[PDB]
Symmetry: C4
Amino acid sequence: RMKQIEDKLEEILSKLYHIENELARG
Amino acid sequence: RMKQIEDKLEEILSKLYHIENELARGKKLL
Amino acid sequence: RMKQIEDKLEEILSKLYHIENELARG
Amino acid sequence: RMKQIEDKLEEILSKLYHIENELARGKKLL
C-alpha cells in the first residue's frame, strides 16, 4: 500500500532518467 | 482515497511514455 | 498524509502537461 | 516509510524542473 506507491514512484523516476538520456543524445 | 492516487500514478506513467515516444519520434525525423 | 501524496502527485502531473506544451511548440 | 516516498516525490519534482529547463534552453538556442 505505502510500498506500492513507492514502488510506482521508483518506476516513474526511472522514466525521468530515461527521458534525460533521450535529451542528452538529441 | 488510494483509488485517486492509483489513478494519478497511472496517468503520470502514461504521460511519461507519451513524452518518451515524442522525443523518440523527434530524433528519428531529425 | 494520503492527501499530501495526492497533492504532490497533482503538481507532478501539471509539470508533465507543461512539458507536453514545451514539446508542442518546438 | 513516508520518508522515502516524500524524498522520491521531491526528486521526481526536481527532475521535472530540470527537464523543463533543458527543453527551454533548447528552444532558445534553436
